[PDB]
mmCIF file of C-alpha atoms and ligand atoms in Angstrom:
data_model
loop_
_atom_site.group_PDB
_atom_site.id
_atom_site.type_symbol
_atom_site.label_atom_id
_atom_site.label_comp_id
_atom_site.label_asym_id
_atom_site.label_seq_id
_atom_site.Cartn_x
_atom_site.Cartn_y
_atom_site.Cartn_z
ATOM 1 C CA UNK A 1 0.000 0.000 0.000
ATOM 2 C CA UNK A 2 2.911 2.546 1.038
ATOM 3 C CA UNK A 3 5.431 1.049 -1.596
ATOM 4 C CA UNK A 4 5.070 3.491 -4.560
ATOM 5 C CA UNK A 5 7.188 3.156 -7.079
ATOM 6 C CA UNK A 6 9.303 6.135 -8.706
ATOM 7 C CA UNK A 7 11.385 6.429 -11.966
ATOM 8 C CA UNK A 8 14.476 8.605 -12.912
ATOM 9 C CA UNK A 9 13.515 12.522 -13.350
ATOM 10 C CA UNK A 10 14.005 12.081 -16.903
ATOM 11 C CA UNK A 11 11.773 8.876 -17.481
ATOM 12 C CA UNK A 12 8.810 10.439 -14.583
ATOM 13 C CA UNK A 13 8.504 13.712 -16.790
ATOM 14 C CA UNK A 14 8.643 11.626 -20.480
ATOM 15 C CA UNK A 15 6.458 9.280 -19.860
ATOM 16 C CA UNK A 16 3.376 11.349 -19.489
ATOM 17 C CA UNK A 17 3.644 12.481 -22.940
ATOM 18 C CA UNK A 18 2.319 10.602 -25.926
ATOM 19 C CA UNK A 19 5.813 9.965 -27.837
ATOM 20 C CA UNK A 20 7.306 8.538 -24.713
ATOM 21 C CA UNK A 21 9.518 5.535 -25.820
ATOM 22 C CA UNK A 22 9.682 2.729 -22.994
ATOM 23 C CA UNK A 23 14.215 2.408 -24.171
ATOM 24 C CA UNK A 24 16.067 -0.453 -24.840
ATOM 25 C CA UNK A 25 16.328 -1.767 -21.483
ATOM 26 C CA UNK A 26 13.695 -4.742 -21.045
ATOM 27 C CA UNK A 27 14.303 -5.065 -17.403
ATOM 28 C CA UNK A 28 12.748 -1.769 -16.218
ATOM 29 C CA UNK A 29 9.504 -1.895 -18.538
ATOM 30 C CA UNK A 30 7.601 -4.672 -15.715
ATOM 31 C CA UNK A 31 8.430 -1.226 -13.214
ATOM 32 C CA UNK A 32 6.885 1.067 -16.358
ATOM 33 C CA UNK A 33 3.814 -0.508 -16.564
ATOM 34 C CA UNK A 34 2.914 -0.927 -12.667
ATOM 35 C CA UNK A 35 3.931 2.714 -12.239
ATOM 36 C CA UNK A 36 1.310 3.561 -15.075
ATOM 37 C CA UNK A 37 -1.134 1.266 -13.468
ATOM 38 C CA UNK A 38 -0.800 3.441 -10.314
ATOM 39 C CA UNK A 39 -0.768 6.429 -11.874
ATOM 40 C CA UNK A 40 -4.039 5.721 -14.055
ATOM 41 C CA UNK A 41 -5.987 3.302 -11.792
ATOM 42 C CA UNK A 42 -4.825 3.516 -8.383
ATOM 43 C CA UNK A 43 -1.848 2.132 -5.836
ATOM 44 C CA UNK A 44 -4.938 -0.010 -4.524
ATOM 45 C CA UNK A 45 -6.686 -1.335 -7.726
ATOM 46 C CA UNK A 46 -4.539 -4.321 -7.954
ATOM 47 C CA UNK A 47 -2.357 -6.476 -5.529
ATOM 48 C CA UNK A 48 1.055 -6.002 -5.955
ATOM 49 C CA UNK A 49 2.264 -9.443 -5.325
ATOM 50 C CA UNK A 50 -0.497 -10.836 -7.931
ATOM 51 C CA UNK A 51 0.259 -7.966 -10.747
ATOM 52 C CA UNK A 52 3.707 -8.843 -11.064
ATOM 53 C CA UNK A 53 3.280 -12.682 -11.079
ATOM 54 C CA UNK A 54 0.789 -11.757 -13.890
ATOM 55 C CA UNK A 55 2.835 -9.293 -15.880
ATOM 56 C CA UNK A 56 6.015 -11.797 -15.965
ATOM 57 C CA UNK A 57 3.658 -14.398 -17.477
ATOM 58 C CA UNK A 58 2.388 -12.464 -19.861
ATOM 59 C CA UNK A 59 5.795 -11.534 -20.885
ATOM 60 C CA UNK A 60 6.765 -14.991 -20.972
ATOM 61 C CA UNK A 61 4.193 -15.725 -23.642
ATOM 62 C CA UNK A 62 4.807 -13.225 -25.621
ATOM 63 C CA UNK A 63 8.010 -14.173 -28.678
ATOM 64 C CA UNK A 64 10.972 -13.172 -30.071
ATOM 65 C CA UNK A 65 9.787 -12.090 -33.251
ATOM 66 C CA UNK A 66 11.040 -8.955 -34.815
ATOM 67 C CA UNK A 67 7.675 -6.242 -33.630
ATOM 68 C CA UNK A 68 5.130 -8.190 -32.446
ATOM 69 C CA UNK A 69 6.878 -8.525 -29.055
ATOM 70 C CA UNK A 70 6.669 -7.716 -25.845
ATOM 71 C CA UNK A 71 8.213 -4.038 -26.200
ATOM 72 C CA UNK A 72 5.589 -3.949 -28.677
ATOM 73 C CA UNK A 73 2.926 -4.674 -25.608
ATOM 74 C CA UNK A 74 4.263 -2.261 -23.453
ATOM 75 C CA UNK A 75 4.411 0.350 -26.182
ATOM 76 C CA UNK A 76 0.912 0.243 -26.638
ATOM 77 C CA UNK A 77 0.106 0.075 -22.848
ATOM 78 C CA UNK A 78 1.729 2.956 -22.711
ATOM 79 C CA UNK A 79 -0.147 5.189 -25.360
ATOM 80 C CA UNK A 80 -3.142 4.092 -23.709
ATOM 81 C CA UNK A 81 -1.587 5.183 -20.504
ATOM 82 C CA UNK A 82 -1.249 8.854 -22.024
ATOM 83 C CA UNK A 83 -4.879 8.717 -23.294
ATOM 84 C CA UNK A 84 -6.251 8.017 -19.842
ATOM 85 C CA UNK A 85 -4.662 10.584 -18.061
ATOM 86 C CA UNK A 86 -4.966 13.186 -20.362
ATOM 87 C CA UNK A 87 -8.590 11.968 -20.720
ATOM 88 C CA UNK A 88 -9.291 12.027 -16.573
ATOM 89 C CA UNK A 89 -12.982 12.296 -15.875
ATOM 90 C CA UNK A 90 -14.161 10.247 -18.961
ATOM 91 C CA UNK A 91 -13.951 6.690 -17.996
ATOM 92 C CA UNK A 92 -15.209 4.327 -15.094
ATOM 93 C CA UNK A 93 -13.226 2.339 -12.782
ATOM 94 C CA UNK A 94 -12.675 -0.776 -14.512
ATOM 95 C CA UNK A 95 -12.641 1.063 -18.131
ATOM 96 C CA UNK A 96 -9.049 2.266 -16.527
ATOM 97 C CA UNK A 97 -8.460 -1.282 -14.862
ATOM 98 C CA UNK A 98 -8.928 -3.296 -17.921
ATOM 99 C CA UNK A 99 -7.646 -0.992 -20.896
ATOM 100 C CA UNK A 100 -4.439 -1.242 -19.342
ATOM 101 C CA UNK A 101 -4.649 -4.942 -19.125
ATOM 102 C CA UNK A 102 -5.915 -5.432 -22.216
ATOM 103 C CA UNK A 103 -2.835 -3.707 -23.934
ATOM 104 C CA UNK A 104 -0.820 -5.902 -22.404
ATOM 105 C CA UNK A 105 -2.197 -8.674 -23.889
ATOM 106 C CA UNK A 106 -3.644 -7.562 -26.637
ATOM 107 C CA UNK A 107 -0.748 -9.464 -29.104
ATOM 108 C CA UNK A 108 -0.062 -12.958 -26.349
ATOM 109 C CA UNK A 109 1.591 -15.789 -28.717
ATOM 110 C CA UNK A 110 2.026 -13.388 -31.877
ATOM 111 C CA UNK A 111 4.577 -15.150 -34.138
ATOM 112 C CA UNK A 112 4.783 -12.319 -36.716
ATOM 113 C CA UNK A 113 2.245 -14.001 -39.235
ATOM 114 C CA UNK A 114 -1.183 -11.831 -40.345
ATOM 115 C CA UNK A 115 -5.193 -13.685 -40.184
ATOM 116 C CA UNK A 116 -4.379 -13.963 -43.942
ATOM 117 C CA UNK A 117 -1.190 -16.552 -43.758
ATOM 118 C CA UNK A 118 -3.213 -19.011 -41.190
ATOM 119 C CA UNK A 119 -5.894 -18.877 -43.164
ATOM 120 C CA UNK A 120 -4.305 -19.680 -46.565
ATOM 121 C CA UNK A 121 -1.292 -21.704 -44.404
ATOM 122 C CA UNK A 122 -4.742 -23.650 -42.885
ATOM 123 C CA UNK A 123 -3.505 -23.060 -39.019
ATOM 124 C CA UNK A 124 -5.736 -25.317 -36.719
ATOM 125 C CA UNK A 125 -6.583 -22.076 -35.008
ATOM 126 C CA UNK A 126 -7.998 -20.752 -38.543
ATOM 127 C CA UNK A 127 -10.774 -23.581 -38.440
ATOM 128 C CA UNK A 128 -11.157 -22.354 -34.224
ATOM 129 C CA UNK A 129 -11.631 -19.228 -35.007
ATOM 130 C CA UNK A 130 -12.910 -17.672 -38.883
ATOM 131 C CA UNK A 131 -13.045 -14.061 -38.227
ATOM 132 C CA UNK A 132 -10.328 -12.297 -35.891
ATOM 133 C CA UNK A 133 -8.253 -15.432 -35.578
ATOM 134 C CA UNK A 134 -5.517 -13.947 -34.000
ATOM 135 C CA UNK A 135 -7.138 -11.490 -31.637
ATOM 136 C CA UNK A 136 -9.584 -14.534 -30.437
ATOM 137 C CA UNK A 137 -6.323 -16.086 -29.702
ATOM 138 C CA UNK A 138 -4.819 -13.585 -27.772
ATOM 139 C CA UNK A 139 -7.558 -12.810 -26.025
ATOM 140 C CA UNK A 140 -8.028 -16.944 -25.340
ATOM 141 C CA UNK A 141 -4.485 -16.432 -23.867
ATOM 142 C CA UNK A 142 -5.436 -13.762 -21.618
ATOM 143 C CA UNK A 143 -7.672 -15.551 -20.183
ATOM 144 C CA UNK A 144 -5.248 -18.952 -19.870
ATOM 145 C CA UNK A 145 -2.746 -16.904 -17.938
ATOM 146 C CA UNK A 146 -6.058 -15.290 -15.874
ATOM 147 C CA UNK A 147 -6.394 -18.628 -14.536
ATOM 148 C CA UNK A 148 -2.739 -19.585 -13.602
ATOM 149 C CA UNK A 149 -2.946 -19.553 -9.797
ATOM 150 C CA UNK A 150 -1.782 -17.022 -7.887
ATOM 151 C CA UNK A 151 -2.781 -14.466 -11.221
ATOM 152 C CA UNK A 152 -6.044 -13.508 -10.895
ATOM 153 C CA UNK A 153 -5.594 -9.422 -10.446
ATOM 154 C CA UNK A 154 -9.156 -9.163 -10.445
ATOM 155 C CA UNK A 155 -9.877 -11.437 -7.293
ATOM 156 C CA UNK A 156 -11.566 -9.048 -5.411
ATOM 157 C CA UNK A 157 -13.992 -7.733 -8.312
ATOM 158 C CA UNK A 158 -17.764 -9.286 -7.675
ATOM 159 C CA UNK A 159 -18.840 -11.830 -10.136
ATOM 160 C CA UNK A 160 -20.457 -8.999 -12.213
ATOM 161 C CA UNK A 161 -17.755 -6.417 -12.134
ATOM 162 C CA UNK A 162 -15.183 -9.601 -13.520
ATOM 163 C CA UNK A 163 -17.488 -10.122 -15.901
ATOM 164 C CA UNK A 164 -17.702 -6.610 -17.278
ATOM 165 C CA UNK A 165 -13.958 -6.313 -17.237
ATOM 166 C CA UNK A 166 -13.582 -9.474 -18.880
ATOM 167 C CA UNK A 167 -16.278 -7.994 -21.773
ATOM 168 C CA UNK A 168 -14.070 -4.678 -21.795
ATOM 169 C CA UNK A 169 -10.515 -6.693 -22.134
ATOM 170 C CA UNK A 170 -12.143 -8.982 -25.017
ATOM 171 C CA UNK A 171 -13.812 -6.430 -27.094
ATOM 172 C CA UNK A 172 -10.877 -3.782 -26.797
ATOM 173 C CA UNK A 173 -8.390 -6.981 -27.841
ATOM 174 C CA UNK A 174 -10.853 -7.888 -30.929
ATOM 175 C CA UNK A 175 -10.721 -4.618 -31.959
ATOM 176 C CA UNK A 176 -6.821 -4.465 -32.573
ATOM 177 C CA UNK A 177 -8.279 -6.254 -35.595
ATOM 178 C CA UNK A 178 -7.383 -3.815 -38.209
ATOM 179 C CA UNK A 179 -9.530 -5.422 -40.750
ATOM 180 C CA UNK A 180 -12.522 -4.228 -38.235
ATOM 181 C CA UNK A 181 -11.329 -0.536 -37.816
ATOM 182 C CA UNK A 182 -12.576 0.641 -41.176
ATOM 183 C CA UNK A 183 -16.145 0.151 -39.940
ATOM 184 C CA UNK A 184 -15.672 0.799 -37.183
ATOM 185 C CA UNK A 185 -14.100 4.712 -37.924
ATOM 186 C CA UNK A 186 -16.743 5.176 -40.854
ATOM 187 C CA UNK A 187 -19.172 4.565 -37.768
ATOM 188 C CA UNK A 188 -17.581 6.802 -35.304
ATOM 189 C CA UNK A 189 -17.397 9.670 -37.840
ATOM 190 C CA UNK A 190 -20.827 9.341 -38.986
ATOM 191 C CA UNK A 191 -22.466 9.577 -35.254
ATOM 192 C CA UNK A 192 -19.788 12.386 -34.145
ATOM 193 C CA UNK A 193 -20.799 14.646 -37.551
ATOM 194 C CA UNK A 194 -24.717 14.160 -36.954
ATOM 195 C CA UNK A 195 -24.582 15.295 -33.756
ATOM 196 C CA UNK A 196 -25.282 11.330 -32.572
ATOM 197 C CA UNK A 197 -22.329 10.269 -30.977
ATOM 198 C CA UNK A 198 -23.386 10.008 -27.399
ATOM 199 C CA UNK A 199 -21.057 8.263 -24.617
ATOM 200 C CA UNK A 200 -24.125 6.660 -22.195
ATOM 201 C CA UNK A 201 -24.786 4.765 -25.304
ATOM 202 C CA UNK A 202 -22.116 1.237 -24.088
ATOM 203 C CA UNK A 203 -22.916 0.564 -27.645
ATOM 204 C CA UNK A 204 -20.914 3.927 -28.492
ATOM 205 C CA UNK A 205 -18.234 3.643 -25.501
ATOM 206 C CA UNK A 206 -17.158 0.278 -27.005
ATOM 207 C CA UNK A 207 -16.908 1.732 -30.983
ATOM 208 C CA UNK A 208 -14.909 4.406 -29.085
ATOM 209 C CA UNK A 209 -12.543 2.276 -27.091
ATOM 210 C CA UNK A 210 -12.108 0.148 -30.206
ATOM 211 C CA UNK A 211 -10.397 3.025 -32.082
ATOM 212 C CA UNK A 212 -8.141 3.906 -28.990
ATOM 213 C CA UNK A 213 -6.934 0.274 -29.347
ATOM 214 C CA UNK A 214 -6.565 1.317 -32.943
ATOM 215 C CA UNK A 215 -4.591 4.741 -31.949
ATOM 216 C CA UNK A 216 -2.272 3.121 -29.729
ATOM 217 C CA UNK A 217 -1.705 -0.360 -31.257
ATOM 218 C CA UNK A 218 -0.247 2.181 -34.512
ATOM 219 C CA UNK A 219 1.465 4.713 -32.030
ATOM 220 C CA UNK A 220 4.316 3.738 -33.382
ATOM 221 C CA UNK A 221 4.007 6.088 -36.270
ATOM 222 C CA UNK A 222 3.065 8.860 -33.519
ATOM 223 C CA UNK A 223 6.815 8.617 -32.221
ATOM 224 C CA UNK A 224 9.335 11.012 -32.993
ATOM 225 C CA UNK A 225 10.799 10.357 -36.950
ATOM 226 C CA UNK A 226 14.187 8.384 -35.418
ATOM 227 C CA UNK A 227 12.117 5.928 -33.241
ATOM 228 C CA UNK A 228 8.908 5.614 -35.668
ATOM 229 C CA UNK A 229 11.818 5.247 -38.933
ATOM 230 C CA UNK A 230 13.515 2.454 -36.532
ATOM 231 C CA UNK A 231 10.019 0.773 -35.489
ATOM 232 C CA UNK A 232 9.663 0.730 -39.555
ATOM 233 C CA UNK A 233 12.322 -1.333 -40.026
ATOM 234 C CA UNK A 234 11.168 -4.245 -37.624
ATOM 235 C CA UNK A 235 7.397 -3.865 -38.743
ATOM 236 C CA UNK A 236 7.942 -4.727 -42.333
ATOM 237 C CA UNK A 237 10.938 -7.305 -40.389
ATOM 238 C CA UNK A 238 7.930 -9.316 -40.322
ATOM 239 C CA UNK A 239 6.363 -8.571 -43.399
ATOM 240 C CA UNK A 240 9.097 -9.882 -45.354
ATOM 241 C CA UNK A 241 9.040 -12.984 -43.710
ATOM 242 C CA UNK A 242 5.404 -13.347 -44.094
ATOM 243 C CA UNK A 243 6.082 -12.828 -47.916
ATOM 244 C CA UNK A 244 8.753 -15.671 -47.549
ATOM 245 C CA UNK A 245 6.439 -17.818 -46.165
ATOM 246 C CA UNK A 246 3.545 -16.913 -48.611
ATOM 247 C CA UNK A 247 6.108 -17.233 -51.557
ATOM 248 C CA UNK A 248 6.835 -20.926 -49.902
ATOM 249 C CA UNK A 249 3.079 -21.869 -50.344
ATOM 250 C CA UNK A 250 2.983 -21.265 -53.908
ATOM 251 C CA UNK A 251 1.657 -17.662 -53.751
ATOM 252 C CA UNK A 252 3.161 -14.424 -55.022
ATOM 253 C CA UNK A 253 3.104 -11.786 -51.473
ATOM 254 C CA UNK A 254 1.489 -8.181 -51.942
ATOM 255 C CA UNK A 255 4.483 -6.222 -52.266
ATOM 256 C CA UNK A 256 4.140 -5.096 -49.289
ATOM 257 C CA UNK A 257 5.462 -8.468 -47.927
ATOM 258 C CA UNK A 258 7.467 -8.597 -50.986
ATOM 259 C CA UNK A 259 11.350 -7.970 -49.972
ATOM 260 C CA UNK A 260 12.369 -8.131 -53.450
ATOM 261 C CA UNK A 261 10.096 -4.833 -53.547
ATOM 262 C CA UNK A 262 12.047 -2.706 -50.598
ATOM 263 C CA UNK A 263 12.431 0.278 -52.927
ATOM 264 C CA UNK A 264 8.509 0.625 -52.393
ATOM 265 C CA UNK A 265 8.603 1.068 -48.422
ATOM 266 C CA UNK A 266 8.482 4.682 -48.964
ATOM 267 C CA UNK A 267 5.463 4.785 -51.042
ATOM 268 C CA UNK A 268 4.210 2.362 -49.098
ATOM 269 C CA UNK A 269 3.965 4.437 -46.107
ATOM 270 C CA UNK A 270 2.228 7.402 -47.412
ATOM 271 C CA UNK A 271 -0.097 5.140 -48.196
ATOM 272 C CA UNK A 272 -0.864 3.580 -45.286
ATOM 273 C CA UNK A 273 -0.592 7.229 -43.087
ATOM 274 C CA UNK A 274 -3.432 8.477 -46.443
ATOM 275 C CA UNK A 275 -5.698 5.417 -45.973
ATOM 276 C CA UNK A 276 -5.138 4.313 -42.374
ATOM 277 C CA UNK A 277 -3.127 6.888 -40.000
ATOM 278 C CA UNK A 278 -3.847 9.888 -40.364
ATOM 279 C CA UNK A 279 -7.656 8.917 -40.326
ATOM 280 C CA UNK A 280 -7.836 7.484 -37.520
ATOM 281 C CA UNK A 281 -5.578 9.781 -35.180
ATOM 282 C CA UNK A 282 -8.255 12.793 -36.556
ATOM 283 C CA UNK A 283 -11.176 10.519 -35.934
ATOM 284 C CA UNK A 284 -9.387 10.077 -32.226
ATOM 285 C CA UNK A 285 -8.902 13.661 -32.029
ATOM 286 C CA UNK A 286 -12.831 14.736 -32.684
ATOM 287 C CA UNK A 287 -14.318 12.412 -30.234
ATOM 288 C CA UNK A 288 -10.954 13.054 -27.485
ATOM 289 C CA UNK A 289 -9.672 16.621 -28.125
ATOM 290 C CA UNK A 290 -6.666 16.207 -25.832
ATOM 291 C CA UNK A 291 -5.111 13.024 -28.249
ATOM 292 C CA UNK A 292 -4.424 15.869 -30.712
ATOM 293 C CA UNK A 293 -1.009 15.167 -29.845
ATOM 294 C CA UNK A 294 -0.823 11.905 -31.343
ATOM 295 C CA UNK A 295 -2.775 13.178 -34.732
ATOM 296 C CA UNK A 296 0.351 16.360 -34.846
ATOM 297 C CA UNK A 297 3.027 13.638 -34.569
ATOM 298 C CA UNK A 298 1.414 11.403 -36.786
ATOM 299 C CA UNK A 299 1.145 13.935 -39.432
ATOM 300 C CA UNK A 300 4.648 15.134 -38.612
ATOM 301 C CA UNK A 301 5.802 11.887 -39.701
ATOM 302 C CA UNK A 302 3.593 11.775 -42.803
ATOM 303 C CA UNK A 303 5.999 14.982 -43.970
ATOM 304 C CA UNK A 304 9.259 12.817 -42.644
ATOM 305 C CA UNK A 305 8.255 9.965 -45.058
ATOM 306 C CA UNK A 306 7.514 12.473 -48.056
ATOM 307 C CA UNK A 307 10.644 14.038 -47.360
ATOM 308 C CA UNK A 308 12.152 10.575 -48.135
ATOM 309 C CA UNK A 309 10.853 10.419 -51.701
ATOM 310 C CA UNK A 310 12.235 13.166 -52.425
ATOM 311 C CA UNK A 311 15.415 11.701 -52.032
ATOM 312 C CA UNK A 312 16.256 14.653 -49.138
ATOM 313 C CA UNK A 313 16.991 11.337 -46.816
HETATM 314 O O1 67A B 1 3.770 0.679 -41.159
HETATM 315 C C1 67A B 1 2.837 -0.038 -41.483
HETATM 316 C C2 67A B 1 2.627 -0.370 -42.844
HETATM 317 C C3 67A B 1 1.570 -1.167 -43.129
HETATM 318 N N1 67A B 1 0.757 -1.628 -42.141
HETATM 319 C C4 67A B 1 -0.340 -2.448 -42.440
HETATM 320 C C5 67A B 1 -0.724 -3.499 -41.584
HETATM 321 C C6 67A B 1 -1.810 -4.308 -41.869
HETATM 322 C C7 67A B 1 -2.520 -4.064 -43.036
HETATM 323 C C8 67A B 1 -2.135 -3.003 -43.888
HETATM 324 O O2 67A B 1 -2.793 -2.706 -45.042
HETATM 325 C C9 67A B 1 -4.204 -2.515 -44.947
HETATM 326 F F1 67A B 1 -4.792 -3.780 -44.815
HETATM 327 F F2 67A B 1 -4.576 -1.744 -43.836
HETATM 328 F F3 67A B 1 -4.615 -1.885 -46.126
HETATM 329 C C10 67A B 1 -1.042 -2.201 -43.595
HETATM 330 N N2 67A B 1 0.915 -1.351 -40.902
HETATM 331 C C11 67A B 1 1.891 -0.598 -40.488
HETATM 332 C C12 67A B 1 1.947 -0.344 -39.038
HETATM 333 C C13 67A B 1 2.429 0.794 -38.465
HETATM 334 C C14 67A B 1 2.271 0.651 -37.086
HETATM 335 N N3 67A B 1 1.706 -0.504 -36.824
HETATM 336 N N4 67A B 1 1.480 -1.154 -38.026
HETATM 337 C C15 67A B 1 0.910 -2.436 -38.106
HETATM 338 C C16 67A B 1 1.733 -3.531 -38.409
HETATM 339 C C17 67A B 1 1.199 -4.813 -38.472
HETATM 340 C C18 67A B 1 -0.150 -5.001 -38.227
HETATM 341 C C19 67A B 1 -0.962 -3.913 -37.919
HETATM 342 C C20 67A B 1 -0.442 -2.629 -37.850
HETATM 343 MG MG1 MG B 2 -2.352 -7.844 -33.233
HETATM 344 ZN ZN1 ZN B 3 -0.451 -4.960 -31.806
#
């Protein structure tokens, strides 16, 4: 109860801002998170002893694949972090206990492989699970390492209150989905413009958690250029072994996944800040004013990645 933790001056003052980067030391992000989950929940809201039993399994499950990792986790625990403090009076108890959580988990088991390559690969969890396949997964995980004894963080939440965090963790992990943030932004856009947005509606507050997942699961390309042109090179890490893989199956990759087609990256990335990005951060900034930091950064790297094509780097 009286054992709060603390961070260097340097790390307590960065890490409330959105393009905080969690460094290359992996020994101090278990403190990172647990010092967020005071911050933004409470030193009460979870038992110590349990929490950390629970975070070090969840690291343990995550892999050593090039993105998809466990930085990657705490990364996007993180920009959540930001979005719930700068966003105070918005959300309910359990909103701020299970966000958190969920970002942890949100990519358990992730071997670096898109929904696509199980499906066309056939992956026994493919035939499990049609739609979502790896987000039912991780979320299937969360709930595995729930159940390890000695981890349930949410022991002393009634039967009701566990279930509505559970429901909170499993839709805001379904909806790192990308395939099902389209909609889901059309949607959002739509009800704020006529006026019909309304956050009583739970039907609304879930849409609207699902494209914070969306904000921070990409806040890598809300970082400043040197970390967010470094996260690019691990991202499409993974890409190009996807296209390895696909190529292996008897299938030409997108050349996205293509690595024979690395001269594209550039115009590849415009692309994806036009049609995915920079929507989605301005979206985020209309329903949540204060994320207008992540929207400026995002767009700041838009003009870092044009500046590329131009051959000026
Ligand atoms: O830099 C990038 C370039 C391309 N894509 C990407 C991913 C998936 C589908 C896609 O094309 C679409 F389907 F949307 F048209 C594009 N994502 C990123 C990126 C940046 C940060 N995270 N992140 C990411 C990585 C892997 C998975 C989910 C997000
Ligand atoms: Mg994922
Ligand atoms: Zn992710």
């Amino acid at each position: 109860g009286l054992m709060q933790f603390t961070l260097p001056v340097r790390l307590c003052k960065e890490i409330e801002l959105f393009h905080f980067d969690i460094g290359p030391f992996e020994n101090m992000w278990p403190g990172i998170f647990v010092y967020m989950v005071h911050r933004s929940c409470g030193t009460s809201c979870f038992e110590l002893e349990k929490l950390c039993r629970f975070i070090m399994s969840v690291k343990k499950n995550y892999r050593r694949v090039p993105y998809h990792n466990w930085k990657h986790a705490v990364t996007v625990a993180h920009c959540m972090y930001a979005i719930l403090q700068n966003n105070h009076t918005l959300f309910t108890d359990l909103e701020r206990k299970g966000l958190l959580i969920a970002c942890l988990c949100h990519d358990l088991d992730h071997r670096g492989f898109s929904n696509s390559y199980l499906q066309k690969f056939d992956h026994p969890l493919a035939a499990l699970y049609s739609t979502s396949t790896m987000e039912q997964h991780h979320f299937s995980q969360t709930v595995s390492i729930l159940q390890l004894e000695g981890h349930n963080i949410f022991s002393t939440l009634s039967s009701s209150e566990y279930e509505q965090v559970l429901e909170i963790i499993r839709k805001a992990i379904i909806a790192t989905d990308l395939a099902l943030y389209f909609g889901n932004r059309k949607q959002l856009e739509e009800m704020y413009q006529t006026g019909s947005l309304n956050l009583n509606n739970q039907s609304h507050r879930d849409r609207v958690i699902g494209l914070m997942m969306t904000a921070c699961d990409l806040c890598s390309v809300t970082k400043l250029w040197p970390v967010t042109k470094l996260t690019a090179n691990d991202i499409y890490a993974e890409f190009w072994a996807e296209g390895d893989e696909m190529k292996k199956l008897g299938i030409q990759p997108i050349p996205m996944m293509d690595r024979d087609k690395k001269d594209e990256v550039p115009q590849g990335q415009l692309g994806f800040y036009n049609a995915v990005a920079i929507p989605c951060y301005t979206t985020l900034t209309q329903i949540l004013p204060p994320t207008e930091p992540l929207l400026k950064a995002c767009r700041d790297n838009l003009s870092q990645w044009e500046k590329v094509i131009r051959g000026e780097e």
